[model samples]
Structure formats: C-alpha cells, structure tokens
Target: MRRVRCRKCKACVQGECGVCHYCRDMKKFGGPGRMKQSCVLRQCLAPRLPHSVTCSLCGEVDQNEETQDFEKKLMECCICNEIVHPGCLQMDGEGLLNEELPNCWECPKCY
Candidate 1:
C-alpha cells in the first residue's frame, strides 16, 4: 500500500508482491524474490561506494588505508556474516578495533 525505504532509495513494495525490484534486479543471489536489500547493498553498492562500505553501520572504505588495518581490512560479522571494514564496527573502540571481537557481532538491524 505504501513504500518501504531501501538503503538508498524508496519504492512501494505493493502488498503481497513477495519481491522487490531490487531483489529482482539482483541476479547474483536468490535470483529474485529470495534476496534482501542488504544483500544488494553488499554485492552491488559496497564495492562501488567511495568508502566501499560493505556495511552501512560505522563503515568507511579507504583503499589507501586498507593495508594498515588488518592485513585483512574486512571483518566478518558473526551474526549475519556480512563482511565489513573494522572501522565500520566502531565497537566502542574496544571491540574489534583492538582485536577484542567477540564470538558474535549483531548488526544494527539484527540487534
């Protein structure tokens, strides 16, 4: 009946449509009605953003600074398994920032 705000855009999903235009345009995963907006952001948008933010939360992509962070700049979220830059987690500066990553990290939407 209305529109749900996607990460960077808005569109009316239409009640019972069972799929979004994003998930439909996404030919990489689930093929259509089976993907999530976050997925497209990661697969399609992240790599394209200047910061290359794989995660919107506390994230920034700096290819220039990539090698200094971890040999592996992108860290994996234990909960959703979304790969994100450690700087993105922020994590109170005592979490992954200092290698204190817990067994699991729940993203904002999940938490």
Candidate 2:
C-alpha cells in the first residue's frame, strides 16, 4: 500500500493515521486536520499570526496596517453568527496578511 508522509513528522504512515507515530509519540501536536479545530501554534490564540482578525471572544480589534482610516467592517462567522473582522473571516492566510485589519485573540464562544 502507498503511504503518505505525516504532516507533522514527515514519516511514512497510513493516510488514515491522524498524526505520525513520531509526532504523537513525541507528544508534539499540529493544527486542524490532525485534530478537528486544533490550534497548534500557540499564536493561534495569541491575537495575531497571519489570517486572524478580531477576537472571536472579545470583539476587539488587533489593527492591521492597511485598514487604518476606515472603520473596520465586521463579518459574522457562518457557524456562530459572531462578529468577526472581515480579514479574520477569510480562510486564506494571504488574504489576512494582504489586508489591513485587526487581529483577534479569542472569540466569546472560544474564550
């Protein structure tokens, strides 16, 4: 059977395996797919990383360079209807970086 490289460990492992044995054995974890909704980079919760906008928990703005003059627009998460920075709502990390907006640390539900 063909094997796919583990995202965290770069080891040959079964595709069904959520994490490589090395990563799991080492106790190191990654984000998202490995575990649904897992935020690996501690920065995931920390205000700014790349694609994050306003705090999903607090509704505070983290301020980006581009959208300084205009009042930042708010978008609601389809799942929660929580107000989120438009930049944060976009799934693409590049979209978040290219746009000037606020970075959010935590959402009310998440916090």
Candidate 3:
C-alpha cells in the first residue's frame, strides 16, 4: 500500500493547494492522470523511505536481506517516526503471524 498522510502535520491539516504538479494532474481539474501522485502540498514532512528503513528495536536494515522475503514490509510509527517490524511488535500473540494491522499505528513510545 502507498504511504498515507500523517494527519497531525500542518500541511495535512490544510487541504490541497490545487495548484501543485500533482493537484493540477487530478482528473477533477480535467487533466490526464499522468502522475497519479499525491499532492506535494500535503505530503508528509518526515516520511520514512522503505529502501533502507531500520527497525528501532532489532537494529535490522531492510537492505541487508538476501532472500527479499522477511524485510519487505516494515511498519513506521506515525507519531514518533520510529520504524519497526510487525513481528517485533509481537502483534501475533505468541508465535503466530499477525493477519492484519492498522495503517495509522502508534509506536510504544508515542502511546
């Protein structure tokens, strides 16, 4: 899934400017959906990229894995901006893997 806006940010607090490159490309404005990108005006100020995100607890970088299996889906805390793995959170309850998780998840520190 694509990353979403952090509703807490000032940019997100306000609506789209409707004048940016992305906004201009919106179908509502009658332009082709060429970019299909989120409005630059509302993009999160501190978004964590998936390429080299490191889990705060395990100290594992997504880049080191050779299989490309275990590290593809790292979760980031919206409030504290801490990146982590869902497995590290023990969200599965003992030994099972979690089936689902909320998009707007808060880190332990933030809560």
Candidate 4:
C-alpha cells in the first residue's frame, strides 16, 4: 500500500487523494463516490496544512533561503532572533521545529 500527505487537508491520506483515486477506492465500500469523499466534500472547507533545535552558542543571520528539505536541520535563536542551519553552524539540527530540541539555546550573537 502507498500513502501520501494530502495536499489539501494536510492529512495523511492513502495514495492519491483525488477524484479518480478516492472514487475508485469506493469499490472497497461497494460503490463509486458513495461516501461523500473529500474529493467530494469541502467544508467551508477542505483543507489545511518541523524543525530541529540547537542553540549555537547558535541560529541565524544571512537568512539563507535554501529550499532544501533541511527544513528540519536548523534552529532559531530565541535571543538574537536568527535562524541557524545546524549544518552551517557546524550542526545537524533545527530548533523549535523537531525532536528533542534543547530546552533553551542562544545564538553566537547573544552570550
């Protein structure tokens, strides 16, 4: 079985959450488009949409806008207000955005 993040509701959906797809999936229920599918429903509606944490001694500046999935590879300085690419800050993290981020951190800009 394959699954994907529903682009609309940001929910984890099975396979493609579209008309032809969810519609066909209906066979499992005993009909076509019987169950008001999301591919069918729109509640006012329809839809919605990590990071890591490290304190540099770490976080930002230069505001490198790289679109890499490293989205989870950096931290933001709660102090100086900067973003830290743990990778660039000689790290491998993302603060306030993911697993086990240190309770508190400071970027080089601070103390």
User: Of models 1 and 2, which has the larger TM-score?
Assistant: 1
Cα-based lDDT for every prediction: 0.40, 0.37, 0.60, 0.41
Stretches of model 3 off by over 4 angstroms after superposition = 48-111
RMSD of 2: 14.1
TM-score of each: 0.25, 0.21, 0.41, 0.24
Clashes of each: 2, 11, 0, 16
For residue 72, what is the lDDT in candidate 3? 38
Q: Encode model 1's per-residue lDDT on 4-91: one tens digit a residue.
A: 2333322222222325466454555346544445433333221212333444454454443546645225444545666555455544
Ranked candidates (lDDT, high to low) = 3, 4, 1, 2
Write one digit per residue (lDDT tens) for candidate 3, span 3-107.
544566676777878898899999987779889887887877544344545677788765434645443346565666667765677443322232233323565
lDDT of 4 by residue, 12-63 (tens): 2334334555555576545565665544332212221122234343443323
How far residue 38's Cα lies from its native spot in candidate 4, in Å, is: 24
Top candidate on TM-score is 3
